[PDB]
Design a protein around this ligand. Sequence first.
Ligand SMILES: [Zn+2]
Length: 235
Amino acid sequence: MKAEVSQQRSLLTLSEVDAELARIAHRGKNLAEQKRLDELTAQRGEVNDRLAALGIALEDLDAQVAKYESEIDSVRQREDRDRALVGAKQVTEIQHELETLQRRQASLEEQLLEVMERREELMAERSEELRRVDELQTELTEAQQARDAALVELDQARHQCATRRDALVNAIDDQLVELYEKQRARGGAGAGPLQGRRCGACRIEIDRGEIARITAAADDDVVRCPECGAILLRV
Ligand SMILES: [Zn+2]
């Protein structure tokens, strides 16, 4: 197999463009902007979970408040129903009933207050978590805007290299482009520069028996690295 040195020179730029396209794809999956978005999203979810659990607690205290202020309403009604006063003999019995009704309302007042201020404390804690999570939300959208913008730049850069690559392939004979892409299917670079003695693809230190035949090969000949099989470009 043989190929013009000018074709091999463009095959070198073709491998470089392909190597740049690979790192462009790699950085897309390892965006620092997404790592920042991942942390803000986790933190916002942490405040969202506490806000949800705080909501359950205030429901319980609201039910306690409602049940407490449903009992005194019957006590206030029991006093109102018995306020109508007609035999004075049994009135003493209705008078001792009012003394117990007043003690039931007074004891219930101590119970409502303990729940009222405890609910007042939780809603205060709920407000500080709302401002906390709202702060994170504004940061989260900024990180999300920064993440999307970083994806646009990578896609723009990838669109560049894809155009330069298309032009390169049209400038090299299909026979050489075929062997190159057949070598990329093996998992390696497909072609690399001979960096002194070591192949530019698999980066192996080629033995001293192969470099003699490689250096002796004609300039227009194509050479494959023994270890990996990639096209070694001496130019
Ligand atoms: Zn190699």
